């Protein structure tokens, strides 16, 4: 439980950098733009997670459908085992049933 | 986001401060102190 004996260098975080000042600027593009672009067309990240939400099972299934043919051999096998385990756990195990 | 307990030093000090006058290994080891402190109260 030994704790550090020297005060760490305090992080001087500037609340007014480019990222924080312009954070969430075009969140109302659809409302104030004649409904030409839905706000879900601004999400940056995975191909299969742009404007989508789900639990762990539905996420792994969705990933295999879209980018399954582009994954590596080892990554593809590990995804299959994760799908099978979640399928068995969600349906054949639990308390409320 | 890996969350770890950092104030664990004060977690055991709140227990050992009531067990400073015991005899044997109950005044140093935490596991033996809690059973002695709980019975003390």
């Amino acid at each position: 439980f030994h704790v550090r004996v020297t005060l760490p260098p305090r992080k001087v975080v500037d609340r007014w950098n480019e990222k924080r000042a312009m954070f969430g600027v075009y969140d109302n593009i659809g409302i104030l733009g004649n409904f030409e672009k839905h706000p879900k067309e601004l999400i940056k990240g995975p191909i299969w997670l742009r404007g989508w939400k789900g639990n762990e099972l539905q996420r792994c299934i969705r990933k295999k459908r879209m980018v399954g043919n582009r994954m590596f051999i080892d990554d593809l096998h590990n995804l299959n085992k994760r799908i099978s385990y979640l399928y068995k756990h969600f349906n054949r195990h639990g308390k409320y049933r | 986001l890996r969350s770890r307990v950092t104030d664990r030093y004060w977690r055991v000090q709140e227990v050992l401060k009531h067990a400073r006058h015991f005899r044997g290994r109950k005044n140093r080891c935490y596991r033996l102190a809690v059973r002695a402190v709980t019975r003390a109260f």
Binding site: V3, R4, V5, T6, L7, P8, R10 | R4, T6, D7, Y9, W10
Partner: peptide, 26 residues
């Protein structure tokens, strides 16, 4: 190295207590 500052600073309160006990001030 655990992230955080409360743990680091709260111990500085303890280090001062030990120094006073070892070398009491006039």
């Amino acid at each position: 190295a655990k992230k955080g500052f409360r743990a680091a600073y709260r111990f500085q309160k303890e280090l001062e207590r030990w120094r006073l006990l070892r070398c009491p001030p006039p």
